[PDB]
């Protein structure tokens, strides 16, 4: 039943005051995009930064298996939009947040489906 739980270890190291994972790949873009969370090309709006997806994935960056039966990555080969206020830690933000499956926005950071 043993499985390394890297997501928990990183959250706990963040809460301990550890420096977030660096060198996530920030893209140049117009910042007039849709603002959706994970896209085929950079889609940051005025309130977001766009990053290369692989560089923002905990499992890619730590060289460990993705937590899924087929080992698939939702980020690699895509771009992830991160709120500018959270762009100091893109890995932590993708790890702690969820994409709304109807509108494609981050819940609590652009999703208005519940209002």
């Amino acid at each position: 039943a043993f499985a390394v739980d890297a997501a928990k270890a990183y959250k706990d190291y963040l809460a301990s005051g550890g420096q977030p994972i660096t060198n996530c790949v920030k893209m140049l873009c117009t910042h007039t995009g849709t603002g959706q969370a994970i896209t085929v090309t950079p889609e940051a709006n005025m309130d977001q930064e766009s990053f290369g997806g692989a560089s923002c994935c905990l499992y890619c960056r730590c060289h460990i298996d993705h937590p899924n039966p087929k080992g698939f990555c939702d980020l690699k080969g895509k771009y992830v939009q991160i709120p500018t206020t959270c762009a100091n830690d893109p890995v932590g933000f993708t790890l702690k947040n969820t994409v709304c499956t109807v509108c494609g926005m981050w819940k609590g950071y652009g999703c208005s489906c519940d209002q």
Partner: peptide, 19 residues
């Protein structure tokens, strides 16, 4: 590959090239 283990140039190329 960069010395930090990511591929910034590849990320720009993927942004640039048609889907």
């Amino acid at each position: 590959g960069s010395d930090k283990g990511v591929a910034p140039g590849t990320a720009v190329l993927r942004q640039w090239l048609p889907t």
